[PDB]
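Example complex used in Figure S2.
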Amino acid sequence: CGWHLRDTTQVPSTMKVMILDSGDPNGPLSRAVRNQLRLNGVELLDKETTRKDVPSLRLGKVSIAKDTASVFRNGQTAEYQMIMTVNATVLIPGRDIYPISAKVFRSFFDNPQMALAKDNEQDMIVKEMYDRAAEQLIRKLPSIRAADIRSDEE
Amino acid sequence: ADLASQCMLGVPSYDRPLVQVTINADHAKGDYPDDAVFTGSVDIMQGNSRLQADEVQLHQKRTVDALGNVHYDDNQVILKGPKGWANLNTKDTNVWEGDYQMVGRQGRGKADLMKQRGENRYTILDNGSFTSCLPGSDTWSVVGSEIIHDREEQVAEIWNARFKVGPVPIFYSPYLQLPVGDKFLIPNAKYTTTNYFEFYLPYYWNIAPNMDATITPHYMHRRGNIMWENEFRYLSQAGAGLMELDYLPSDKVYEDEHPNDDSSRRWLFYWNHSGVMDQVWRFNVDYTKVSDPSYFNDFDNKYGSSTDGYATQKFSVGYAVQNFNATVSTKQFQVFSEQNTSSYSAEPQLDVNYYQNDVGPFDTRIYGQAVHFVNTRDDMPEATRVHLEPTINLPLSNNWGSINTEAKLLATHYQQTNLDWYNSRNTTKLDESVNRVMPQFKVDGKMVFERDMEMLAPGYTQTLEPRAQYLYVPYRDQSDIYNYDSSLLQSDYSGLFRDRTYGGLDRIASANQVTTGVTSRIYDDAAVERFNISVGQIYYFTESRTGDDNITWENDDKTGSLVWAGDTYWRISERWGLRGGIQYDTRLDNVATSNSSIEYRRDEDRLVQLNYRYASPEYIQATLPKYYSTAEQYKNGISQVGAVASWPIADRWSIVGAYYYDTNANKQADSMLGVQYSSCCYAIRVGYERKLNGWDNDKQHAVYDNAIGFNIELRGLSSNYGLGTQEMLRSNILPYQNTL
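Predicted assembly (894 residues):
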């Protein structure tokens, strides 16, 4: 076999307490990221706190774009492709600031009949995209601890 | 060397002082106060600037006068002329018969009198000229009776304007305006086979702090009139937005090709708003409306495409906090096709969520919705729906796995009205009052395994992530509820784990299923994710049904492992990336949908992308209006190969192209070919675009539109030296997206 059950936690132990900072702390990305952090057992502190030795995740711009990816033989839209790009940065006490980002791709067939149903489907896809963006950002945290450690070796 | 480095070789450099009075002369006479004079060659400095002359002749009663070779320069300008004056208290300055150059940016000319005014925010020129072209090059210039420029609002503004190409005037305007600085339209001209000669001549008006308009006459020579384009951009306590209002008073092409209409007017209104106030109030507008169905077939614009079947009209206002949100919205749709007038709208929709974590070991949430559904037709059903969704879950986790148990109650009340036309035409009746109450139960379980991948490269690691979910929802007949909001969703790999088959609340299918999948990831020695692949399937223990089971399929089988899906990404390098996705459905006996891309990007101007998209004929039957199965333009599915590419030549050309091909038709969907040549003071672009743009019902074949276009823009009005690639790459239907 060779396989083993993961011993080290997905969020690195230096980030088991961290600060979540956003221009929109009540909105969709902040809610997706906060739930993803809590499922990993992270303790989250407020943007202003008495601690000075706690890392922070600062959530930046989200861009969502839908474009026609495909057309029927009359040239009307068959499929939209939706891309969500999320930029964030991770700040470590007394150390350099590490950029991280997520890129989420989804698609759906249009229907000009049932336009109201397709908008509910698009809103539901966008809600799922914030969850995949939050996963992708959390899966990038081990690379920040690797770069942090290697910056001392350099 | 890049175009910036070629143009900046003609732009004058500042470096003489250091940046953050002293005087030298051949001779000096008169006492220092009032009438001191310096005779023979003189240079004088103060901080950021120097003045130089054959004579300087002061007075105080504070004024400087200067005669012979008067030359002044600083960190923003050079001024030269035979005579000059300045007031040292007000900072006002004059130079007579002079020439000027900007410092650190392009811009030069002459005036009979050059002035600095208004705490030197304004420069003003009598009988002035302006060009962005480098010294010794005069390929265009603008000449005025008066020119003003404002350094704060970054605009030049000119009265009795003549535009010259070489020495020859080709335009006059009694007033004209040019952008001059960093702070998106610029004066522009086009020729095209679609509209013949065109121009775009934008004017920028500051209305108040951080709200500004761009009123833009757009001429189209094939047509009767100037289109007036009217972008308004703003910031506010409620957030930021853009409005547009395109208008043609009448349109000869629409009057010729759609005669006997009540009026010839063509217009578009677009309003976008988004933002948050006090971190708690959220405002959004996503609204487009047009005069007639054909507007986007006729007019190239940012705010829709000939590719579109409807214009969307959303408004919403919401309150959101950490533990609660409520949003009131309107969703409306202008459908362009005359084939069916039916279009439902939510007028209004109220959505509410409340969240309460740590209630014992449980986390709880409740979702509520109230919506009123209205139709464009007088004879379609109308409804009020109230939905309530109390939810409880128990998240258990450790280092290597998790299990999440969730229970919901799905409670919905319908009051449906205007039923007589439907119930007099259909065998299964709609009911006035319907109550639908359903329990839902979900168990989602995940694990993670790791392995050393030293077979591939030193220190790499492989992760294996198996997931299994059980879902239960008992059957309810819902054929007595009209489907106002519920589209059939698409099963991507992450979609294999939804608790919903339809995107709204008018159809909730029975569920009795296990969904199973695995993801594997490869990480390098930097712990960066280099590769992933995911594969999964849904096994159904009972037919997933709503009482409205009206779908064809190709097999009668409704149990077992019916749905399969998978996805992959490979980050081959920082420059190469490969993506792929597949769905298969045993009810269709076929691959349902698939897509792929491979991409190479060196930089913003050097890239190649190859992509493929597929949808099965049987998937079109199952998921789209029944007549798509019969119509030749829809029934064949999708089997589209695309290639998109950009590359620079000789640091000044960019060549861009795209080609999309239907493999079932053996015919092109779109092809595009852009060539832009960029210089320091102009860029010229050729843009070819051939697209599918309709269907000929009398002959059963595709209608193509060909645009052969040529365009010219001015340059060095701003810091822009980019070769135009990312704009060219999004000019067509099927526009480029970065797949790395």
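The beta strands of chain A are 4-5, 17-22, 43-45, 56-71, 77-91, 97-109. The two ends of chain A are 36 Å apart (CA to CA).
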